[PDB]
Design a protein around this ligand. Structure first.
Ligand SMILES: *[C@@H]1O[C@H](CO)[C@@H](O)[C@H](O)[C@H]1NC(C)=O
Ligand SMILES: *[C@@H]1O[C@H](CO)[C@@H](O)[C@H](O)[C@H]1NC(C)=O
Ligand SMILES: *[C@@H]1O[C@H](CO)[C@@H](O)[C@H](O)[C@H]1NC(C)=O
Lengths: 98, 49, 294
């Protein structure tokens, strides 16, 4: 005799049941990094955030409807996010013939 | 003179993903570490959620 | 026991206008001192909502009101009490132990969310004796428990811990939405101290999100479950002998509407204005401000 079990998982995905994200990763700060806090992927630089959320708040938003702060799902601390540094270049020349 | 000609940015190098722990899990030990097993005709039908 | 108790007072519904209640945080985003216009489900300002009551001032054994109600798109329930007479809810479509029903029962140790189906009586409720060993000796909520696949347990929503009979320092407001197979419940328990027992308080509040359920079943009808403290105020028999206490609760409704809300420095809601009530309100909504010049 052999002890056997048959697993039968249904479909149609209307009653989302089990799933799993797992595979948490590490954290870094003050560098240009990609972040996937809760599937709201972005890129930028992390820092602290003195402002206080409400207990049920998850991630903030500023004027013009952009992400500005996110609470980490692990440590439950509201960090602040800033977009990556960038800019424009101007070239000053005194004359090719000179 | 002056000539606006170029645009620069700083690109990342690494990625980080986070999730709210694994506090709740699916108890499956009772299936494999079952005290006694079900008969051939008829069976236990355990619904997982 | 389905009791079917006598002295059933069937009365016309008292009407009370909806005085600037029915606002809730639409989502989980955070803001800081901004103005936002949102189109969503809300209770329209100044609408006549239904008033129900169970009171023993004149009729200790005759004032009970537990009829069925329609759940079209959502309700704004409010209750003013001090001894927690209102204790449960029930939903579903047929309620004949054939369709799933939500028995949100507060309990005392732990709130229980149940999807299971039951054959409820014509007048289901709960009663608990006046004895020192207080306990719901009457589990008259139903008599049959057939089938289901999901249950949930959590810490029971807190009480004010003000168990007196004077000015009702217990006021609890709830909103129940059912969209996208998600049953979402917002609530807030405002204690206050003193208020004239005319109608719902005249002021402003907010409704923090509390719970979500992914159960996803269609809902068309519901009602409330009152657990009674059957006491010796009318001593003797139980089925006919009891007290109606003093409890009042208001039931409203939800409609799709556009609102303008403002946030404070730390992100809480202070006041809001609808976009369909008055021409001045329409002007405020369109101009996107709370002030206007000549
Ligand atoms: C995650 O688990 C760790 C384990 O020590 C704990 O310190 C942390 O507070 C937990 N965070 C959450 C959000 O559950
Ligand atoms: C109320 O709490 C007790 C304590 O655990 C529990 O045994 C009981 O099942 C709860 N009531 C219901 C209806 O589940
Ligand atoms: C906002 O909340 C902070 C703390 O969270 C407090 O210091 C501040 O006084 C509050 N301001 C208002 C207007 O509520």
């Amino acid at each position: 005799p052999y002890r056997v079990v048959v697993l039968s998982f249904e479909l149609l995905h209307a009653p989302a049941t089990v799933c799993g994200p797992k595979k948490s990763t590490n954290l870094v700060k003050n560098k240009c990094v990609n972040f996937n806090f809760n599937g709201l992927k972005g890129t930028g630089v992390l820092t602290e955030s003195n402002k206080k959320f409400l207990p049920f708040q998850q991630f903030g938003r500023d004027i013009a409807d952009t992400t500005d702060a996110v609470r980490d799902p692990q440590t439950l601390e509201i960090l602040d996010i800033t977009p990556c540094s960038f800019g424009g270049v101007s070239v000053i020349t005194p004359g090719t013939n000179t | 003179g002056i000539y606006q000609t170029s645009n620069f940015r700083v690109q990342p190098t690494e990625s980080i993903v986070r999730f709210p722990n694994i506090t709740n899990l699916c108890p499956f030990d009772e299936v494999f570490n079952a005290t006694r097993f079900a008969s051939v005709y008829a069976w236990n039908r355990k619904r997982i959620s | 026991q389905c009791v079917n108790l006598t002295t059933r007072t069937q009365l016309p519904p008292a009407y009370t206008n909806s005085f600037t209640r029915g606002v809730y945080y639409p989502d989980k985003v955070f803001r800081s001192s901004v103005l936002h216009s949102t189109q969503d489900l809300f209770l329209p300002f100044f609408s006549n909502v239904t008033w129900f009551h169970v009171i023993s001032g004149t009729n200790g054994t005759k004032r009970f009101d537990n009829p069925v109600l329609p759940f079209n798109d959502g309700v704004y329930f409010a209750s003013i009490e001090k001894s927690n007479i209102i204790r449960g809810w029930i939903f579903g479509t047929t309620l004949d132990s054939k369709t799933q029903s939500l028995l949100i029962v507060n309990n005392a140790t732990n709130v229980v969310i149940k999807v299971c189906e039951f054959q409820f009586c014509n007048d289901p409720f709960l009663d608990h004796k006046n004895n020192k060993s207080w306990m719901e000796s009457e589990f008259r909520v139903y008599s049959s428990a057939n089938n289901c696949t999901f249950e949930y347990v959590s810490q029971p929503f807190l009480m004010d811990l003000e168990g007196k009979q004077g000015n009702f320092k217990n006021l609890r407001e709830f909103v129940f939405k059912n969209i996208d197979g998600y049953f979402k419940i917002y609530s807030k328990h405002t204690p206050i101290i003193v208020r004239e027992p005319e109608d719902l308080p005249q002021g402003f509040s907010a409704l923090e999100p509390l719970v979500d359920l992914p159960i996803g079943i269609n809902i068309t009808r519901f009602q409330t479950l009152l657990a009674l403290h059957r006491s010796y105020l009318t001593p003797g028999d139980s089925s006919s002998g009891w007290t109606a206490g003093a409890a009042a609760y208001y039931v409203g409704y939800l409609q799709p509407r556009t609102f303008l809300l403002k946030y404070n420095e730390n992100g809480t809601i202070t006041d809001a204005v609808d976009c369909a009530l008055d021409p001045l309100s329409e002007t405020k909504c369109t101009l996107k401000s709370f002030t206007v010049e000549k």
